[PDB]
């Protein structure tokens, strides 16, 4: 009743990872193109990441949203675990941002609406992402944002969290300060993301990790002159020191700047 | 690299898939999955 590697035509590698590679593949029965992430069982075990991987799969395999990369199913053989994933034709968002330097307002606003919608879907299920940044996002056929990696994600039904996690430039003050945190950390990262989209560099960029931490906890935000008042309004509302004061995800979707600039299109559904 | 996985044959296929999505929830979300507990054990 289940999949094996012989059920697919391997097309070519898409990603080079350090636990295995990702390949563009075609499922034979349906000639459906997808991505196959291949992980080696002994390397995962030696590195002690079995439970981590289990948790990532459990979370991603139960999320169904147009702006979250789908994990259709998975299977394994003697030496490998195979994850059947949605193929994001336009690739890595960080490569696109690097190529353009910075995104215009339409592009940025569209990504923000998609991000907020996907994050809202996660939070409604008590899943906190905790590592939103360009590198963890892929792009669909029409350029739609796809949250692709859930490496730091957690299902947190009750208990606030204590783990520091994420990425330096995106860490919220509460994590730096050793406080407990909750889903509002994703609101903060969404604000850093919006700024980096429009500016091309994260807001608290500094020569040293202690200077970056200092800028974050003081919320030392300095907006470049070219940013529009609307974009600064949204960023400022997300990058609040106090978690409870951060603009809610529904507030991001309803923000006038997002409404005025986003050109979001929902992909066709079966 | 197989023909289907590059250039125009691939682009056309990708476009076709976007506009004519298959019922993945049934086509793949109906197929058995190994228990996550079993992933690192005998296949």
* Selected residue of A4, A13, A27, A32 to mutate for chain B interface (largest B Cβ count, 10 A): A32
The two three-digit tokens of residue A189, written as one number: 């990262």
Dist CA B42 CA A7 (whole Å): 20
Dist CA A89 CA A142 (whole Å): 9
Dist CA A69 CA A105 (whole Å): 24
Place of tokens 């963890």: A136
In chain B, what is the greatest distance between 2 CA atoms, to the nearest angstrom? 42
Dist CA B20 CA A227 (whole Å): 39
Dist CA A212 CA A218 (whole Å): 10
User: At A85, phi and psi to the nearest 5?
Assistant: -120, 155
Q: Do B28 and A84 touch (CB under 8 A)?
A: yes
Dist CA B25 CA B27 (whole Å): 6
Going across the sheet that includes A21-27, the strands are A8-16, A21-27, A32-40, A80-85, A71-76
Dist CA A68 CA A134 (whole Å): 14
* DSSP string of chain A, one letter each residue: ----GGGEEEEEEEEE-SS-EEEEEEETTTTEEEEEEEEEHHHHHHTT-HHHHHHHHHHHTT---TTB--EEEEEE-SSEEEEEE---TTEEHHHHHHHHSS--HHHHHHHHHHHHHHHHHHHTTTEE----SGGGEEE-TT--EEE---TT-EE-SSS-B----S-GGG--HHHHTT--B-TTHHHHHHHHHHHHHHHSS-TT--SSHHHHHHHHHTT-----TTS-HHHHHHHHHHS-SSGGGSPPHHHHHH-HHHHHH----PPP--
The three-state secondary structure class of B7 is helix
Residue A30 near residue A20, CB atoms below 8 Å:
no
Resolution (A): 1.8
- Supply the angle between the helices A105-123 and A229-238 in degrees, to the nearest 10: 20
CATH entry 3.40.50.300 includes domain A1-88: no
Dist CA A126 CA A216 (whole Å): 26
DSSP-derived letter for residue B31 is S
Domain parsing of chain A, residue ranges: 1-88, 89-262
List Cα–Cα distances, A107 to A88, A197, A199, A246, A262, in angstroms. 17, 9, 13, 23, 7
User: At A149, phi and psi to the nearest 5?
Assistant: -115, 135
Method by which the model was determined: X-ray
Dist CA A196 CA A23 (whole Å): 29
A82: β partners: A38, A75
A226: β partners: none
Dist CA A222 CA A146 (whole Å): 29
Distance of CA A242 to the CA centre of its chain: 23
Dist CA B26 CA A73 (whole Å): 11
User: At A25, phi and psi to the nearest 5?
Assistant: -140, 155
- Annotated catalytic residue, options A131, A149, A169, A186: A131
A190: Cβ contacts below 8 Å, ≥ 6 apart: A112, A115, A116, A119, A132, A238, A249, A252
The two three-digit tokens of residue A175, written as one number: 């994590």
Residue A65 near residue A73, CB atoms below 8 Å:
no
Dist CA A261 CA A109 (whole Å): 6
Q: Is A131 a catalytic residue?
A: yes
Residue B14 near residue A141, CB atoms below 8 Å:
yes
Find the chain A residues whose C-beta atoms sit closer than 8 A to any C-beta of B: 1-3, 9, 11-12, 24, 26-27, 30-33, 41, 44-45, 50, 53-54, 57-58, 61, 64, 70, 72-78, 81, 84, 87, 89, 140-142, 267-270
List Cα–Cα distances, A259 to A143, A234, B29, in angstroms. 18, 12, 34
Q: Which residue of A has its CA nearest to B28?
A: A72
The CATH fold assigned to A89-262 is: Transferase(Phosphotransferase); domain 1 (1.10.510)
In chain A, what is the greatest distance between 2 CA atoms, to the nearest angstrom? 59
Dist CA A18 CA A219 (whole Å): 35
Q: Provide Rg for chain A, Cα atoms.
A: 19
The C-alpha torsion from A162 through A251 and A127 to A187, rounded to 10°, is -30
């Amino acid at each position: 009743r289940k999949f094996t590697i012989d059920d697919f035509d391997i097309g070519r590698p898409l990603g080079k990872g350090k636990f295995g590679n990702v390949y563009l593949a075609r499922e034979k029965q349906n000639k459906f193109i997808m991505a196959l992430k291949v992980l080696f069982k002994s390397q995962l075990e030696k590195e002690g990441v079995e439970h981590q991987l289990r948790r990532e799969i459990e979370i991603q395999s139960h999320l169904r949203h147009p702006n979250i990369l789908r994990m259709y199913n998975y299977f394994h053989d003697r030496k490998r675990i195979y994850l059947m994933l949605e193929f994001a034709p336009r690739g890595e968002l960080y490569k696109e941002l690097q190529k353009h330097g910075r995104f215009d307002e339409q592009r940025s606003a569209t990504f923000m609406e998609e991000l907020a919608d996907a994050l809202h879907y996660c939070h409604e299920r008590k899943v906190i992402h905790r590592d939103i940044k360009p590198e963890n996002l892929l792009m669909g056929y029409k350029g739609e944002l796809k949250i692709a990696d859930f490496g730091w994600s957690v299902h947190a039904p009750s208990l606030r969290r204590r783990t520091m996690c994420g990425t330096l430039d995106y860490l919220p003050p509460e994590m730096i300060e050793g406080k407990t945190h909750d889903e509002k950390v994703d609101l903060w990262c969404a604000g850093v993301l919006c700024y980096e989209f429009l500016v091309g560099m994260p807001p608290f960029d500094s020569p040293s990790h202690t200077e970056t931490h200092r800028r974050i906890v003081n919320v030392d935000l300095k907006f470049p002159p070219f940013l529009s008042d609307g974009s600064k309004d949204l960023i400022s509302k997300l990058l609040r020191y106090h978690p409870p004061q951060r603009l809610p995800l529904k507030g991001v979707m309803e923000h006038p700047w997002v409404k005025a600039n986003s050109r979001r299109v929902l992909p066709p559904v079966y | 690299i197989p023909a289907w996985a590059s250039g125009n044959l691939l682009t056309q296929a990708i476009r076709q898939q976007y506009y004519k999505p298959i019922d993945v929830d049934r086509m793949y979300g109906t197929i058995d999955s190994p228990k996550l507990e079993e992933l690192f054990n005998k296949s």
